[PDB]
Amino acid sequence: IEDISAMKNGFIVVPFKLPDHKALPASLHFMFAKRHQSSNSNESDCLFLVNLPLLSNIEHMKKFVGQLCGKYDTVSHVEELLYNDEFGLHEVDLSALTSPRNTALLKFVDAASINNCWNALKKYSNLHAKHPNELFEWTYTTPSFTTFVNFYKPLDIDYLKEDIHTHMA
Amino acid sequence: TATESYDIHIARETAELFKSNIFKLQIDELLEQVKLKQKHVLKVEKFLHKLYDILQEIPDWEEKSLAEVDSFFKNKIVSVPFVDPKPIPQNTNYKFNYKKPDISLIGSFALKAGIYQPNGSSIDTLLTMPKELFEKKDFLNFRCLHKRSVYLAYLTHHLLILLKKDKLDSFLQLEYSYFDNDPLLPILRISCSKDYNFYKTRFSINLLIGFPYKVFEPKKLLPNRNCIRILPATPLYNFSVLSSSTHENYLKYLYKTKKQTESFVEATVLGRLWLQQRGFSSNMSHSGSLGGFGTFEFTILMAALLNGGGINSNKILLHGFSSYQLFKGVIKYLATMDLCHDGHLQFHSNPASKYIDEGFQTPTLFDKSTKVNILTKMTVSSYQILKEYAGETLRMLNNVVQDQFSNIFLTNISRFDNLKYDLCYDVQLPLGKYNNLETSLAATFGSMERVKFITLENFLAHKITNVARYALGDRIKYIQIEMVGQKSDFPITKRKVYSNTGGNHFNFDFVRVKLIVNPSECDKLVTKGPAHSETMSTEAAVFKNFWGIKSSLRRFKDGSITHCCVWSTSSSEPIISSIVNFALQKHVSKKAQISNETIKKFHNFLPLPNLPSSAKTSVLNLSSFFNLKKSFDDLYKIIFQMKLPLSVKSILPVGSAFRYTSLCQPVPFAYSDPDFFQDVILEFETSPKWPDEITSLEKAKTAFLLKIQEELSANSSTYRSFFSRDESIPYNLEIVTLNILTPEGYGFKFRVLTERDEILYLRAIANARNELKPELEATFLKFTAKYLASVRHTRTLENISHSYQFYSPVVRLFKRWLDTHLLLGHITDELAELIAIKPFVDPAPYFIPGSLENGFLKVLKFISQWNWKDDPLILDLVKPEERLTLAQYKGIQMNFTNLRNSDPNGTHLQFFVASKNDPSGILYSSGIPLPIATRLTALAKVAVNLLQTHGLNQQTINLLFTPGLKDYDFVVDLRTPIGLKSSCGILSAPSNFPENLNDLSEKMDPTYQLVKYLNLKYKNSLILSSRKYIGVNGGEKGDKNVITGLIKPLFKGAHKFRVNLDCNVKPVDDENVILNKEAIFHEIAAFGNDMVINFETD
């Protein structure tokens, strides 16, 4: 298993060490990455990512790429994380109809940034076999009590008023 | 006229044809199923033939004094089964003798109406003592009965000798018993253990000793005559004596009728089975059993109705009637023609039967030929119950829609007292011996009582019935007193049944008082007594004496002053429990110990609201819900009267509180309660200006809510309000509710519904690509349930609940049970509500539930037996006798069979639950994971089995509400940093809303959101379950939750790596992957983090 650096379909295997939890007895999470091919203009210089860790966001992805850059002394700037709909909330466009799950695109600022990252990922994918302790830990965002109860809070009236008033004009 | 008669007859035949034809085929099949094989009849007839020979060889002995018989038997194994009062030398001038009997057969076997019974059946062999053994005064003072007992004893002795000789004694069993459990009539019973061995036939032989027809003047043995000189009439005694002379008479009468009427035997089998399922038999009911009306009485009644029966002596049944018409006609007569308080039936077994509209206050079917009251063995309480079962069966027989055959004949309703009855009280009565009764029994059991009641057991059962009936009044509908542990058989070495059980020397261990409750009256505060006047009426004196210290005077709202008793309600028990305790201890025995702990345990599993006097509030009290509605009503007026750009057309409250189904009763300011915010649908007058796309439509709706909120905040500032997102309609991201907090402390959430909404969802389905249509259908279903169907669901349940008073607390307890087992999160409230209503709207062959225990156990029993793969649940959501027609019912059945055509195992849809509100059967039960449905069925079976095995008690009730948490891939313990029991409005009190409405959230369940988002993330691969009501089911502080996890079978094995697998996986090689358990576990632990206390994995 340690010897599997890439899947047959061209996806590089990108493992992370899992942080400890008080309630659980070094396990890995496996993300998968491939260069995205798209004739769509805003999907340029993207890695197609399969199986992102819980609550992945741009800050976490920038940290990861930065650790890669530091380890392999290279330069890579991440622009955006696209189509990260972890909870399936936007899976169907109801708006359009009334008139790739578990996956996302990691978009880089230019062709050089992605090429550098991709080269770094290739070497990263061989660590499992050669130096498993050199794999990076993924530290989950850990939602607080406040984060969960926030879901119950009122909508901001002034934002709402503005949103509605403008849209209705 | 003949042509008139014929036209009516053809009209009736046509009207009855559909059910008639179906019933006949079912009857044919049942009869084949229970048919006695000729080989068995023939095999016992062989033993019976030998028995007749043996008996014919018993030699006559000689006229003997009591002293002489005593001497004769003293040294022998056999005892004389003398009845109480057994004869004394000083009071017995006559003597005793045995001569060869006339042998004959009676009962079903003689009529060839026997059926295969797993338990077996008896053949009644009649042995008539010769007329010369009797003096014409022998009907008096137990003379004939003492002569009878010696005759039987002498027979039993010589039979035993002759059986030993033929070697038959090695497989034959002899014992004494009482015919029809009549203690005046001991008999000998012969049975087989494993050529004359008839063991495999399941027969037993009863040797009945009878008297010759008319040996005693029948008029001297009339029910109103005295035959024990000590004067009070002795109807019980007289029946035992007189009917001992009429056994052959009745067999002849029944045989003649059978010969005249083609379907008589078939109808007899139907009657026997109908009575058997309902716990009735021919046995004496006066000693604390349900009966006095078995196969024999059914056939005698049927025979009488075949020779008249009308008020003007017209025929009720015709000789050519099918077995269906015969059975139905007997049931209809039993249902509608009163034989106790208001009338009786007269017949002639030797002329037309005539209903007479005067009642004797006891069940009466009177044979003018023989002077026998056929119904003597029935108590009033047994008859009243029989008549109600008859009424229910008559209704079932007239149902032209749902098939009732199984309910009528195939369902034993007598196995479990707590299902058959609403309340059952165990009464210990350690009365001691007969000589102890002066102090152990509050009423006198003297000479007059022994003459009337014959036994202490009869006297006692009647006393307890009469006391409980008077004490309870209109709080009950029906009552049965059961002598538990009563025995009918005794050794040939004993005089009678002896007992030392239950701290007494009488024939019972204890007494059970079993009640059918009247829910409109059962828990009322006031027991109403006679009017108060200047001098005490007899009725008022009786009332005062009966109630003692409990009796007082009270002024009613109408100005009347009457004698009454006032009781205290309790959340824990019905007033009935207090009354039974008080009345039995005062009027039956100071030693009585009354217990009914099961009802209290069920009561205490309903969460107690933190409201004034909560613990003293009836389970039937709905004030909490009414107070919420009153608050809503005030807000309704304000909004309805607002001047807005469109006028308000409808404001329709659709939350659980509006139909009395909220798990917890609503409490002011209890905003931790999951049901705190009550949904309300707001509709404006129609307008062509609503947007034609969903985003703009929802924003336009929100614009109207903003105008409402603005006006509310300006001029009704004791209301507070805010806006909330509703994310529960998948893919509609712009729905906003206006949440209003009333000054009374209640919460309402308003959403707008337009005439454009449904059109847009339907268009979305039409527009979606084929692959996506299912998802858009599911969205539309969620929309329909919330916005459209919620109004009819709520109106229907609110309305019919008034006729089903125990439904509200039963469904609430059911939800609590579902939540303790982590099911409630997957089962919609509406589905839970519709399953729970089944025993109320479709009770047959039971009665509508009249207690919390009765209703709750009926719901679990229903689920335990519901094969949801094979059968739909189709409900007529109506009050007791708008019902589905035959065509509508079949159309719904076809929705089910269509569905099963492409979903034959219920993998996609398990519980099909339909009604006039939802003929699709799937509005409230779609999208449930199969493992969840199977677990619900499994738990109901576990529950029913636990109760069948270990009985209903405090320990097993506790177990019903304990999750097992076994068979899961993982189990996570959660603890929230703040306990919510108090702020949920549950007594282990909220008093205001927070200054900043952002702080409402600080007392809301964070674990609810946690589990919601976990399910959204892992929908494709996992099934996660948790408690929805942490305040109720989270322990003493309401802070503990649990998440259970199941890996979907689709993900227990490896798969090809694909981009759309939607699962957290690890590679197993370069082509294949497998679900990564350790990673998933770490994700879940990290998601809950500080709230995750324990994590167990398979």
Residue numbers in the entry:
A (entry chain B): 3 to 27, 32 to 105, 120 to 189
B (entry chain A): 81 to 274, 282 to 317, 326 to 445, 453 to 983, 1010 to 1116, 1128 to 1237
Excerpt from the paper describing this PDB structure:
Utp22 and Rrp7 are two proteins associated with early 90S preribosomes and form the UTP-C complex together with four subunits of casein kinase 2. Like most early-acting SSU synthesis factors, Utp22 and Rrp7 are required for early processing of 18S rRNA and 40S ribosome formation. Here, we determine the cocrystal structure of Utp22 and Rrp7 complex at 1.97 Å resolution and the NMR structure of a C-terminal fragment of Rrp7, which is not visible in the crystal structure.
The full-length proteins of yeast Utp22 and Rrp7 were coexpressed using recombinant baculoviruses in insect cells and then copurified and cocrystallized. N-terminal residues 1–80 of Utp22, C-terminal residues 190–297 of Rrp7, and several internal loops of each protein were not visible in the crystal structure, likely due to structural flexibility. The N-terminal half (N-half) and C-terminal half (C-half) of Utp22 are structurally similar to each other and are arranged in tandem along the longest dimension. The structure of Utp22 can be divided into eight domains (D1 though D8). Both the N-half (D1–D4, residues 81–689) and C-half (D5–D8, residues 699–1237) are structurally similar to class I CCA-adding enzyme in all four individual domains. Utp22 is likewise an intramolecular dimer composed of two copies of CCA-adding enzyme modules. These structural observations indicate that Utp22 is inactive as a CCA-adding enzyme. The NTD adopts a two-layered α/β fold, which is similar to the fold of RRM according to DALI search (best z-score = 4.8). The NTD and linker region of Rrp7 associate with D6, D7, and D8 of Utp22 through an extensive interface, which buries 3,116 Å2 of solvent accessible surface area per subunit.
